[model samples]
Target: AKQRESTDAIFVHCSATKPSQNVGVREIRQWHKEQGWLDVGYHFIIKRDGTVEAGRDEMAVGSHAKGYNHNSIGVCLVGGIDDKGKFDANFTPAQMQSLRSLLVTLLAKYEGAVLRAHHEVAPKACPSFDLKRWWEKNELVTSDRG
Candidate 1:
């Protein structure tokens, strides 16, 4: 339940639209090819209903972040945030469950890897969900709050 490589950080993003939206993995990849990139920008894509799709392959370089691709893995959660488009829809509890399990496993396997939200790096409201807050209030704290 852990990654084999020691990770420095993990970058996450919200797809900014549904996974099955007319423009999907295929289109994204095609566009990447057009732009002379090797593959889709992200490493993983999780659907609205919690389906996880692979992107850019594990060994391939991602086109997500500006300059952090080499050492970071990107995971995109499907869906746009809010009216201002600055906030993403709440990540489904189901998705959170899956995400937690995935992260736990990866943490165990990857040694000292730190899990982070995409907004942490880029100057955009990505992953739209407040994943950083979630991690801080939920995992890093010992409070009984939920």
Candidate 2:
């Protein structure tokens, strides 16, 4: 994958793994490779402890969201499933904090890059949260490119 000229948006995603799971960037990269993708679909992965790990290089175009990948950066959080294995917003406080900080940095680095939810560009609930609403609540700016 080659670097894009400029990113238009940052898409948020969730691993859909249970809260107990501590999946990281390496695991995700392997999973994507197993699925036949050239590399990990996301550019960054937030661990349960709120640790941010690098996945595919930031310059590389990601393979995460369909249709939106060409001009978007993919960011994934580790956990989004409940004890019963149902999709839910089960992100840890640390993860949320780290994500907020990461988004701020990325947005500054990529001019005009807006924040978006995976659901905004895709039909499935991979992130299991209302990112739009969350952004609105936080008063963060977003885009309608998706």
Candidate 3:
């Protein structure tokens, strides 16, 4: 098992599943194994019930992002698509709340690490959400609510 040579970014991603389907770490890890990979690409798995599960070792490099996997921690949410088969950001409040806590928790360990959606780092719209916009709307001390 090779450890990451660097740790600078935390990449938010989605498992690309539909709303009607719910998946967990076991299923995800199995999917990755079936795909002939060593293990699940995402280091952290976000469940529909707001549960956070560990998929791979935190020190190991992940397979989520191409060309950037070496220095990034991949956190994958259980969903990204709607029942209509269209891509969208349809995360539940539970999942969102879980993500918030996970972010701060990760920040405590990796101070100054940048946060980015997989879309920003990759060519595809993985997370299917405007994370930067979400951050701006959720910041506590920022300009707004004046």
Candidate 4:
């Protein structure tokens, strides 16, 4: 596992769990570990309550997105499934708020960084939502967490 020298893009994903699951980075790290990743694939995991938890090392090359891990950052949201166990955009308002705020800082840190959804690079709807449309709706975001 090597540290990243540069970040070219930021990839958003979903935990693919139901809204009621209430899981966070600890659960994800275990999940990824079970998959033989040794660590959580994502760099950050936003919980159902909007708590932002660190996953993998922020500066290290990630194992989340295939083919893009070496040059990108992975951000995973907590909820993306419905009661029927089907794909859906079930993120809460607080989760969305935290995500938007976190993006502001990450985007500034990785200047000129491209923002993309997992679906943009992979065939699956990993995020299970429209990142573009969602971001556009919150164009006036300003973080109050200074």
Per-residue CA lDDT of model 1 for 34-97, tens digit only, reads 9897678887776656666678765455778777776667777666554454554555656666
Whose lDDT is higher: candidate 1's or candidate 3's?
A: 3
**TM-score of every prediction relative to native:** 0.73, 0.88, 0.90, 0.92
Stretches > 4 Å off in candidate 4: 139-146
Worst 10 residues of 3 by lDDT: 137-146
Model 3 segments more than 4 A misplaced: 139-146
Error of 1 at 143 (Å): 21
Residue 132 miss distance in model 2 (angstroms): 2.9
The best candidate in terms of lDDT? 4
The number of the candidate with the highest TM-score is 4
Model 3: per-residue Cα lDDT over 1-146, one tens digit each: 79987789888888889877788988999999999998899899989889999988998998999898899899998888877766777777788889888988887798678888877755677787777766668522211111
**Tens-digit lDDT track for model 4 on 62-135?**
88888898899999999777888777887888989999989999999899899988887777877888787789
Off by over 4 Å in 2: 136-146
Q: Among all windows of ten consecutive residues in candidate 4, which has the lowest summed lDDT?
A: 137-146
Q: What's the ranking of the predictions by lDDT, best on top?
A: 4, 2, 3, 1
RMSD (Å) per prediction: 6.1, 3.9, 4.8, 5.5
- Model 2 scores worst on lDDT over the 10 consecutive residues at 137-146
lDDT values for all models: 0.63, 0.82, 0.81, 0.84
lDDT of 2 at 28: 86
